[PDB]
């Protein structure tokens, strides 16, 4: 569960992401496909080359869901219900993959937030990404 | 990986397996216990309920083929990497199958073997099979890039 | 979550565990120590040899907690409040390990319940034990 | 395995690393992000808040020896298992540390490398380090029985 200091931290860090969420989303995905090649088995339909439009478009959607999760941080199961359904019933990405993407998102933030990625914020973002993942797989079976 | 007493006990137990029924039942249970795995088989028909899944002939037939290759792999316990290299490249480049499925199938197989042999699937025999299904998973995953 | 069916399935298999819970916990633990050796790092203070007395006792303790959990399936977070505080604040077992004891608990059940370990029931037991594990690690950070 | 270009990228980035500093920074952060890992350090004193961890002198002194051994291993990429053989034995037999800790520290370490180097820690540089940290970790878990 996210504490009051966790939410303050996520909101502060994500707030600083601002207009770059889409770009960061795309960069985390590239980091993931490059670092964890098995994750690419879920996008056989994507041209996965650096800067592809498919990956660029998908990163924006991923960052937009996260930006939504921060805005509804005290009500994530509901704010993420549609996405949760999508993942459980159609995509069916195996659960072990959310941790891989979550790690690449933290790495992407670290890389971009020299001042804000303090030990404390890093701890909170990890809990947050872990919580978004749990909601997204909560209806798997 | 396996000690010689482990290699022996595995061969020993395998030779009593009906690979056809165990493969059908394992893949069947995989689709039932971890439903998201059904994603690769929408063309198999009715997978709506547990008996529909366990009863599905395409599930049963694919199970037999899959556990057959596995079984053939048990004759390559010294170089599983080499024996599955082609199947590994195939599952990655062609089937786009996430390797975690090979580990999930591994544990379902262990539960099936336990269910079938009862007492005879001893803690030590299981430990040996945990090494094997983990080796076959890694070997199958070895070529993904 | 656990459906009303998963609960009916859990109660029935576990009901059939009878005064055997101690032996099956001990068995589940022995299977886990032998199959996944890294789990022994958490019991450098137990004699871990076959038929070991501490293993037999801990096995009973683990079984009884599940028996309490089955009886309180609708409200596990609460029934297990104290045991989750214990794993989160003192024992601090790494979360990767709960999936290993759970697997071993299923192998144990299957090996002892040929009649009841149907595919559906195997499904429910797996959901139950992961749900228990989730409660047990919910207060970790 | 790492490609000759990955080894180069890794060694070159590591040449810029203050090992004592990264060591204190990665151990501290492991203890803050995954607080249950503090279970092995009751003797380090106050670990109650993030600053109490990051600034604890025993945590800093320890990060130094940890990343120092890690740093040495980097000069032995073709033989991580033998390089870490005696520390594997020690972490298992004497400290009783679950190997999953080595993988959690590997990821925190990658996060600290990205935070320090910013854009310079490129996705291809990260993939190279992911293989290194997974390698160290497998090397440190190898002697466990
Ligand atoms: C941070 C966790 C994640 C979030 C917030 C999330 C979010 C999204 C969103 C918003 C969509 C777009 C839905 C739409 O088009 O309406 C989506 C689709 C999808 N996601 Fe997830 N996702 C996450 C993790 C994962 C992971 C771990 C993978 C696989 C490694 C995955 C695989 C996919 C794929 C295959 C699609 C379909 C994309 C396409 O064909 O365009 N997702 N996800
Ligand atoms: C346990 C290790 C496994 C082995 C030994 C194995 C082996 C095989 C073999 C023999 C083939 C046919 C290859 C050929 O065309 O010659 C195949 C195909 C296939 N396997 Fe695997 N497999 C394994 C596990 C899995 C799992 C767990 C899934 C996913 C739930 C899976 C999904 C597929 C798919 C979808 C195909 C093609 C299906 C079709 O065309 O009808 N495999 N496998
Ligand atoms: C199914 C999940 C689990 C259940 C229901 C469970 C149950 C229990 C119970 C009832 C106690 C006894 C505490 C007391 O006497 O007050 C306990 C102790 C303990 N558990 Fe957990 N546990 C689970 C998983 C784990 C895991 C996965 C590990 C390790 C791999 C673990 C390791 C420990 C240790 C080392 C103790 C201390 C035992 C001693 O000092 O004798 N537990 N657990
Ligand atoms: C890259 C991975 C790691 C390396 C290279 C490493 C290396 C070291 C070194 C060189 C020593 C001193 C050995 C001695 O005292 O003779 C040590 C001690 C120790 N390590 Fe590790 N370590 C690793 C990660 C871990 C992690 C992840 C933790 C646990 C969260 C851990 C827990 C300990 C503990 C409890 C000690 C003893 C501390 C004391 O003296 O009180 N290590 N390690
Ligand atoms: O066998 C070994 O000594 C190593 C080599 O391969 P990696 O550790 O790099 O996978 O591990 P294993 O083949 O069991 O996975």
Task: Spell out the domain ranges in chain D.
Answer: 1-145
In the DSSP assignment, the letter for residue B37 is G
CB contact at 8 A, B77 and B131: no
Q: Do residues B132 and B2 make contact, with C-beta atoms less than 8 angstroms apart?
A: yes
Put simply, whether D94 touches C (Cβ < 8 Å) is no
| CA–CA dist A21, A67 (Å, integer) | 8
Q: Which two tokens stand for residue A95?
A: 């659960």
How far is D73 from D80, CA to CA, in rounded Å? 6
Residue-number span of the structural domain to which A113 is assigned: 1-141
Q: Vertex C118, ends B72 and B112: CA angle to 5°?
A: 20
- When computed from its CA atoms, the radius of gyration of chain B, rounded to whole angstroms, is 15
Q: Cα-flanking dihedrals φ and ψ of residue B81, to 5°?
A: -60, -55
Closest Cβ opposite residue C94 in set D33, D92, D100: D100
- Total structural domains within chain C: 1
On whether the CB atoms of residues D133 and D110 are closer than 8 A, the answer is yes
The set of residues, in sequence order, having a beta carbon less than 8 Å from that of B5 and lying 6+ positions away, is: none
What is the rounded CA–CA span in Å between residue A111 and residue C18?
A: 56
Q: What single-letter DSSP state applies at residue C1?
A: -
Shortest CA distance to D108 belongs to which of D22, D45, D44?
D22
Residues in contact with B120: Cβ distance below 8 Å, sequence separation at least 6, in sequence order? B13
> Would you state the torsion angle of the CA atoms of residues D21, D27, D32, D36, taken in this order, to the nearest 10 degrees?
-170
- H helices of C1-141, in order, are 4-15, 21-35, 53-71, 76-79, 81-86, 98-112, 119-137
Between helix C21-35 and helix C98-112 the angle, nearest 10°, is: 120
Neighbours of B85 (CB within 10 A): 15
Closest by alpha carbon to C71, among C24, C138, C17?
C17
CA distances from A109 to A97, D6, D19 (A): 19, 23, 23
- Please, are residues D81 and D142 in contact by the beta-carbon 8 Å criterion? yes
Please indicate if the annotation marks D81 as binding a ligand.
yes
Query: What does residue B95 show for φ and ψ, rounded to 5 degrees?
Result: -80, -15
User: Which residue in C30, C107, C118 is closest to B110 by CB distance?
Assistant: C107
Q: Exposure string (b/e) for C102-133, b if CB count within 10 Å is 16 or more?
A: bbbbbbbbbbbbeebbbbbbbbbbbbbbebbb
Structure tokens at B60: 């049963």
Measure D50 CA to ligand 4 centroid, in angstroms.
20
Q: How was this structure determined?
A: X-ray
Measured between CB atoms, does C52 come within 8 Å of chain D? no
Kindly report the number of other CB atoms within 10 A of residue A78's CB atom: 10
Q: Does ligand 4 have an atom closer than 6 angstroms to the CB of D105?
A: yes
Alpha-carbon gap, residue D106 to D84, rounded angstroms: 15
- CA dist B72 and B9 (Å) reads 17
Atom of ligand 5 nearest to the CA of B138: 15
CA dihedral B64, C31, B128, B5 (to 10 degrees): -140
Q: Do D118 and A107 touch (CB under 8 A)?
A: no
- In this structure, the number of other CB atoms found within 10 A of the CB of residue A103 comes to 23
CA pair distance A118, C15, nearest whole angstrom? 50
Q: Contacts for C133-137 with beta carbons within 8 Å, 24 or more apart? A: C133/C95, C133/C98, C133/C99, C133/C102, C135/C76, C135/C77, C135/C80, C135/C84, C136/C80, C136/C83, C136/C84, C136/C87, C136/C98, C137/C84, C137/C87, C137/C88, C137/C95, C137/C98
DSSP helix/strand/coil, B77: coil
d(CA A101, CA A63): 12
If you classify domain D1-145 with CATH, what class do you get? mainly alpha
Q: Which backbone phi and psi does C50 adopt, to 5 degrees?
A: -55, 130
Residue A60 near ligand 1, beta carbon < 6 Å: no
3-state SS, residue C137: helix
Distance (Å, whole) CA D8 – CA C138:
42
Residues 6+ apart with CB under 8 A from A75: none
Nearest CA to ligand 5 atom 15: B138
Tokens of D100: 């999953």
Nearest-neighbour CA in chain B from A15: distance (Å): 34
First vs last C-alpha separation in chain D? 25
A119 CB neighbours in chain C (<8 A) are none
Distance between CA atoms of A59 and C48, rounded to whole angstroms? 49
Instruction: Kindly state if the Cβ of A61 falls inside 6 Å of ligand 1.
Output: yes
Structure-block tokens of residue C10: 């859990």
**What 3-state DSSP class applies to B2?**
coil
How far apart CA B69 and CA A61 sit, in angstroms, is 40
Cβ neighbours of residue C95 under 8 Å, at least 6 residues apart? C133, C137, C140
**Three-state helix/strand/coil letters over chain D:** CCCHHHHHHHHHHHCCCCHHHHHHHHHHHHHHHCHHHHHHCHHHCCCCCHHHHHCCHHHHHHHHHHHHHHHHHHCCHHHHHHHCHHHHHHHHHCCCCCCHHHHHHHHHHHHHHHHHHHHHCCHHHHHHHHHHHHHHHHHHHCCCC
Work out the angle at residue B21's Cα, subtended by the Cα atoms of residues B17 and B22, and round it to the nearest 5 degrees.
60
Subunit contact D117:A119, Cβ cutoff 8 A: no
Q: Are A84 and A135 in contact (CB under 8 A)?
A: yes
SS3 of chain A: the string is: CCCHHHHHHHHHHHHHHHHHHHHHHHHHHHHHHHHCHHHHHHCCCCCCCCCCHHHHHHHHHHHHHHHHHHHCCCCHHHHCHHHHHHHHHHHCCCCHHHHHHHHHHHHHHHHHCCCCCCHHHHHHHHHHHHHHHHHHHCCCC
Residue D5 burial class via C-beta count within 10 angstroms: exposed 0-12, middle 13-18, buried 19 and up? exposed
Tokens at residue A43, please?
A: 């996008």
Residue B121: list chain C partners with CB under 8 A: 107, 111
Token pair 């180097």 in the structure block, residue: D117
For residues C51 and C29, what is the distance between their CA atoms, to the nearest angstrom?
11
Half-sphere exposure of A88 (CA within 13 A, CB side): 16
d(CA A133, CA D130): 21
Nearest-angstrom CA–CA distance, C56 and C50: 10
Structure tokens at C25: 């916990």
Tell me if residue B78 falls in helix, strand or coil. coil
State how far the Cα of A110 lies from the Cα of A117, in Å rounded to an integer: 6
Query: Residue A38's domain is classified under what CATH number?
Result: 1.10.490.10
Atom 23, ligand 2: residue with shortest CA distance: B66
Are A109 and A125 within 8 A, CB to CB?
yes
Give the residue from A93, A24, A33 showing the smallest Cα distance to A62.
Answer: A24
Burial class (CB in 10 A: 0-12, 13-18, 19+), B38: middle
Rounded distance between C-alpha atoms, residue A24 and residue A26, angstroms: 5
Chain B residues in contact with C112 by the CB 8 A cut-off are 118
Nearest-atom number in ligand 4 for the CA of D84 is: 5
Q: Write down how long chain C is.
A: 141
Other Cβ atoms within 10 Å of A64 Cβ, number: 13
- How far is the C-alpha of A76 from the C-alpha of A72, rounded, in Å? 6
B90 contacts B125 by C-beta, under 8 angstroms:
no
Interface list for B 27-86 with A (CB within 8 A) = 33-39
Resolution (A): 1.9
CB contact under 8 A, A1 and C127: no
């Amino acid at each position: 569960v996210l504490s009051p200091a966790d939410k303050t931290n996520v909101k502060a860090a994500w707030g600083k992401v601002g207009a770059h969420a889409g770009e960061y989303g795309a960069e985390a995905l590239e980091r993931m496909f490059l670092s964890f090649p098995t994750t690419k088995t879920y996008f056989p339909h994507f041209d996965l080359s650096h800067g592809s439009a498919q990956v660029k478009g998908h990163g924006k959607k991923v960052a937009d869901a996260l930006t939504n999760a921060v805005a509804h941080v005290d009500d994530m199961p509901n704010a993420l219900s549609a996405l949760s359904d999508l993942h459980a019933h159609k995509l069916r990405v195996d659960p072990v993959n959310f941790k891989l993407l979550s790690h690449c998102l933290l790495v992407t933030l670290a890389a971009h937030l020299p001042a804000e990625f303090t030990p404390a914020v890093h701890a909170s973002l990890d809990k947050f990404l872990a919580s978004v993942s749990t909601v997204l797989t909560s209806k798997y079976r | 990986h396996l000690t010689p007493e482990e290699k022996s006990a595995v061969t020993a137990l395998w030779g009593k397996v009906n690979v056809d029924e165990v493969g059908g039942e394992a893949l069947g249970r995989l689709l039932v216990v971890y439903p998201w795995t059904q994603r690769f088989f929408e063309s198999f028909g009715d997978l709506s309920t547990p008996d529909a899944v366990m009863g599905n002939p395409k599930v049963k037939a694919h199970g037999k083929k899959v556990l057959g290759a596995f079984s053939d792999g048990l004759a390559h316990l010294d170089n599983l990497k080499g024996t599955f290299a082609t199947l590994s490249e195939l599952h990655c480049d062609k089937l786009h199958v996430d390797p975690e499925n090979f580990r999930l199938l591994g544990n379902v197989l262990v539960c099936v073997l336990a269910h079938h042999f009862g007492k005879e699937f001893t803690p030590p025999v299981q430990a040996a099979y945990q090494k094997v299904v983990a080796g076959v998973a890694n070997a199958l995953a070895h070529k993904y890039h």
